[PDB]
Design a protein around this ligand. Structure first.
Ligand SMILES: CN(CCOc1ccc(-c2ccc(C#N)cc2)cc1)C(=O)NO
Ligand SMILES: [Ca+2]
Ligand SMILES: [Ca+2]
Ligand SMILES: [Zn+2]
Ligand SMILES: [Zn+2]
Length: 163
């Protein structure tokens, strides 16, 4: 639940930028999924996420395939859906999504909202949880995204780090 090292952000207002998009969704659906994902965490912590359209942000979001400059190369369809880096500089906090996945804003494989939510947990300093019902569980498992309210274990996790 608590990323080893207890890494966390010192600023409460973090900027993020969607650097690019996946052809499978309009920029809007991606935008929406990403904003809602940050909102899941902001409603359970003091963190406030602000979107910028160009420039460098605290949290860069991007869809890449295979090798993409951080040597945690993606692996084509399925398997690794995405990853993020713990609070830090440059790549720290950034979230990368495998561009070769079947991204969607709905429930089928793979719901971008849910994955982004999960990755942002990492972006904020959360490690994986052993609770199968937790968003930070190691494996992707769809949950009703509509009224989807951050699982309690994840709330405990983020609260433990930021209060
Ligand atoms: C290498 N490994 C990346 C694997 O790719 C992954 C692994 C798991 C998930 C995931 C897990 C639970 C939910 C929920 N609810 C949603 C998405 C997304 C990408 C990581 O360390 N980062 O997740
Ligand atoms: Ca993959
Ligand atoms: Ca960053
Ligand atoms: Zn990456
Ligand atoms: Zn993870």
């Amino acid at each position: 639940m608590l990323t080893p090292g207890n890494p966390k952000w010192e600023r409460t207002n973090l900027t993020y930028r969607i650097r690019n998009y996946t052809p499978q969704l309009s920029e809007a659906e991606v935008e929406r999924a990403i904003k809602d994902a940050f909102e899941l965490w902001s409603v359970a912590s003091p963190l406030i996420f602000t979107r910028i359209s160009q420039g460098e942000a605290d949290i860069n979001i991007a869809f890449y395939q295979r090798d993409h400059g951080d040597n945690s190369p993606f692996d084509g369809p399925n398997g690794i859906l995405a990853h993020a880096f713990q609070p830090g500089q440059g790549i720290g906090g950034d979230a990368h999504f495998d561009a070769e996945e079947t991204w969607t804003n709905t429930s089928a494989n793979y719901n971008l909202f849910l994955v982004a939510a999960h990755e942002f947990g990492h972006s904020l300093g959360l490690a994986h949880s052993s609770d199968p019902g937790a968003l930070m569980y190691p494996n992707y498992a769809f949950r009703e995204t509509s009224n989807y309210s951050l699982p309690q274990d994840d709330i405990d996790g983020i609260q433990a780090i930021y209060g």
